[PDB]
Structure formats: structure tokens, C-alpha cells
Symmetry: C7
Subunit: 30 residues, 7 copies
């Protein structure tokens, strides 16, 4: 369904944010 | 549907937050 | 609908957060 | 509706987070 | 309703995040 | 309900983020 | 259901963000 697909798109965007947050942690360690 | 469209708008905003978080990571590397 | 309108209001708030995160990146570059 | 009202409450909390993120940017500029 | 109550629980968690973000700003100022 | 339960799981994950943000605040104060 | 499943996927992504935020705190302590 379109609603479930859009919710999965939200989850995908949140995973992109998680990736970026890990990059922030790595930048701080470096 | 309007609800699914709005959920996709939320996903797009979250992708722009991911953009900004990558920008923070780059600023910390520099 | 009121639900779709409220979801769009959430999207707008998330864009507001993205803008604020970009301000953080700008402060870190400076 | 109660669901729309709760969604608007979520949007309000997200705007509160945006304010705090701008406060972080201001602290970094200082 | 249980759905509205769960959405209000989400907003409550977001306000705790806002609190923490304000304390991050306070820490950076000091 | 399964939808309400999943929303409560989202709230719980947001509380975990709030926990982490408090840890960031305490790290900056230390 | 597909909607509840997608909401649980959102919660999973939020937990990934929480993990990353904890790693930011650890990097700041380090």
C-alpha cells in the first residue's frame, strides 16, 4: 500500500540520518 | 492519497536532515 | 483532511530542524 | 480529532527541538 | 484512543529530546 | 492494537535517543 | 500488518540513530 510504502521511505531516510550520525562520531574520533 | 503524500513529504524533510548531518560531519573533519 | 494537514505540519517542523542543523554546520566551519 | 491533535502536538515538540538546535548553533558561534 | 495515546507518548519523548538539546547548548556555553 | 503497539515502540526508541542526547550533554559538561 | 511492520522498521532506524548518538557521546568523552 501507498501508506506502508511511504512509512518505509521514512525509515530509509532515518537510516540515512543514522549513517550521517556515525560519520559525525568518526569525525570527532579523528 | 493525501495522507501518503504527506508521509512522503516527511521522508523528504528527513533526507534534508540527513544532508545537514553529513554537512556537520564534513565541518568537523575540516 | 486534518490528519494530512497535521502530517504536513510535522514535515514543516522537520524542515525547520534541517535548517537548524545547517546552522550548526556553518558555526562549526567558522 | 484526537489523532490530528496528537500529530499537531508532535509537530510542536519538533519545533521545540528546532529551537534548541538553533541554540546549539548560537553556542558554537559564541 | 490507543493510537492517539501512543502519538502523545511520541510527543512526550520528543520533549525529553528537546530538554537534552537545550542542555547541550548550555554545556557548550560553559 | 498492533499499530498502537508499533507507535509505542517508536516512542521507546525516541526515549533511547533522548538518553543518548543526555549522554552528549554530560560528556560536554565533563 | 504492513503498516505496523513499517512502523516497526521506523523504530529500528531510530534505535540505529540512538546508537550513533551514544558513539558521539563516547567520542566527546574520549
Amino acid at each position: 500500500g501507498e501508506i506502508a510504502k511511504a512509512l518505509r521511505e521514512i525509515a530509509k531516510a532515518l537510516r540515512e540520518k543514522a549513517y550521517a550520525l556515525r560519520e559525525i562520531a568518526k569525525a570527532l574520533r579523528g
